[PDB]
Amino acid sequence: GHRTLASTPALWASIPCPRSELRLDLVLPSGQSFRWREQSPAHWSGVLADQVWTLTQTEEQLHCTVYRGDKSQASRPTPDELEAVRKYFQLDVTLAQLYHHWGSVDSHFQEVAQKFQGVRLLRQDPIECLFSFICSSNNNIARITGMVERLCQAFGPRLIQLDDVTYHGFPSLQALAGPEVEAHLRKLGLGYRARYVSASARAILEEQGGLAWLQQLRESSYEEAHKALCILPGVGTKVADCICLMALDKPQAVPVDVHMWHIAQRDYSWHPTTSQAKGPSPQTNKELGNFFRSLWGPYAGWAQAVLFSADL
């Protein structure tokens, strides 16, 4: 079944990484990616780039193992595979300097940072991110996590089965654009958003050129990327911001919803000023987003991530 470092050490490869730079337990289930579960104490297993991985860490090292199936000899991750993991967690970025900066302009963040170290922003795949946040609202992590799993088990390739868990890759655009998708997804419990999955897949696979379109937004400006995504069915300002931040390399993006409003009110006593509205709205939400961006800087999105992990 699921591997453990202690049970099959010869099948694990390590990546130099202090616990001060990463805390799997605070990142994997914090609402960025919904593809990871701690199937075993301190061991997180999930799907990363069409491959099942299990990850665990020691004080100074992030241990990794990948499952290859019956077509290939079981062996430790190769240098390139490990590099894929490093990019996923964006380890090239020194968290220390970010935490230092955020704390220097925000006493509240400084106090929260003390108990919540190693919170970083994952670099997810565009398609996986886009459709995960479109298939369901995000009011509850447990909820969207179940919906994403149903989405993958319904149109995602079967990768492998460990113990009583069948892992599936993320559905391809062609699979989501296929007929009867909405109907089947609804039968699964998805809801009306099952329509956006199908519609968006078809909109991209066709009217947008296809996969290349998303990969392009990664290089486009945050302003272009966000505006481009909003044309897709089910993609609003908030969802577009998540994708920009989590998958299109736009760290300054700050997804604003009722959750962030609570944080702003509870921890910053923030109040709208540029808008007459006192509660959430297209105008006040943008002002709120700009408030944190101007406060925290170009990586405002990562700072938000730290507060979210702390609030779980």
Q: How far apart are the C-alpha atoms of 4 and 99, rounded to whole Å?
A: 31
Q: 163 and 244 share a domain?
A: yes
Q: 51 and 32 share a domain?
A: yes
Find the CATH number of the domain harbouring 41: 3.30.310.40
- The experimental method, as deposited, was X-ray
Comparing CA positions, the residue from 259, 13, 19, 150 lying closest to residue 27 is: 19
Which listed residue (238, 250, 278, 286) is catalytic? Answer: 238
Residues annotated in a binding site for DNA = 138, 143, 193, 259, 276
Q: 244 and 258 share a domain?
A: no
Decide if 287 is inside a domain. Answer: yes
- Per-residue CA distances from 102 to 78, 112, 224, 294 (Å): 35, 11, 27, 11
Q: How far apart are the C-alpha atoms of 108 and 44, rounded to whole Å?
A: 30
Residue labelled with tokens 């990768």: 159
- Amino acid (1-letter code) at residue 20: S
Backbone angles phi, psi at 52, to 5 degrees: -80, 135
Residue labelled with tokens 């297993």: 45
CA atoms within 13 A on the CB side of 202: 14
Residues 6+ apart with CB under 8 A from 85: 15, 48, 53, 55, 62, 64, 77
Q: 133 and 245 share a domain?
A: yes
Q: Are 294 and 106 in contact (CB under 8 A)?
A: no
Our CA angle for 125, 41, 121, nearest 5°, is 30
Backbone angles phi, psi at 295, to 5 degrees: -75, -55
Domain count of the fold of the chain: 3
CB neighbours of residue 91 within 10 Å? 18
Residues annotated in a binding site = 138, 143, 193, 255, 257, 259, 276, 304, 308
Q: 85 and 38 share a domain?
A: yes
**Reading across the β-sheet that carries 13-16, which strands appear in turn?**
13-16, 61-66, 52-57, 43-47, 36-40
Q: 173 and 283 share a domain?
A: no
CB neighbours of residue 121 within 10 Å? 24
Q: Which two tokens stand for residue 197?
A: 């999955």
Residue labelled with tokens 């990586």: 299
Q: 290 and 191 share a domain?
A: no
Find the CATH number of the domain harbouring 174: 1.10.340.30
Last residue of a domain, one of 89, 105, 136: 89
Helix axes 237-246, 282-296, angle to 10 degrees: 30
Q: 245 and 132 share a domain?
A: yes
Backbone angles phi, psi at 89, to 5 degrees: -90, 0
Decide if 119 is inside a domain. Answer: no
The reply to whether 238 belongs to the active site is: yes
Using the 8-state DSSP alphabet, how is residue 70 labeled? T
Q: How far apart are the C-alpha atoms of 85 and 64, rounded to whole Å?
A: 8
Q: Strand runs (DSSP E) across the chain, as ranges?
A: 13-16, 36-40, 43-47, 52-57, 61-66, 158-162, 165-168
CB neighbours of residue 75 within 10 Å? 12
Residue labelled with tokens 């990546």: 15
Residues 6+ apart with CB under 8 A from 193: 134, 135, 136, 137, 234
Q: How far apart are the C-alpha atoms of 211 and 232, rounded to whole Å?
A: 14
Which residue segment(s) compose the domain that 30 sits in? 1-89
Q: How far apart are the C-alpha atoms of 185 and 199, rounded to whole Å?
A: 13
Q: How far apart are the C-alpha atoms of 27 and 33, rounded to whole Å?
A: 8
Q: 104 and 154 share a domain?
A: no
Q: How far apart are the C-alpha atoms of 267 and 307, rounded to whole Å?
A: 10
Find the CATH number of the domain harbouring 279: 1.10.1670.10
Q: How far apart are the C-alpha atoms of 195 and 234, rounded to whole Å?
A: 8
Backbone angles phi, psi at 62, to 5 degrees: -100, 110
Q: How far apart are the C-alpha atoms of 60 and 12, rounded to whole Å?
A: 15
Backbone angles phi, psi at 170, to 5 degrees: -80, 140
Q: 242 and 262 share a domain?
A: no
Q: How far apart are the C-alpha atoms of 230 and 249, rounded to whole Å?
A: 17
Q: 236 and 272 share a domain?
A: no
3-state SS string for 13-62 = EEEECCCCCCCHHHHCCCCCCCCEEEEECCEEEEECCCCEEEEEECCCEE
Report the sign of the C-alpha dihedral through residues 220, 290, 231, 149, in that order: positive
Q: How far apart are the C-alpha atoms of 102 and 97, rounded to whole Å?
A: 9
Residue 137 pairs with which residues in a beta bridge?
A: none
Which secondary-structure segment (H or E) carries 268? helix 258-268
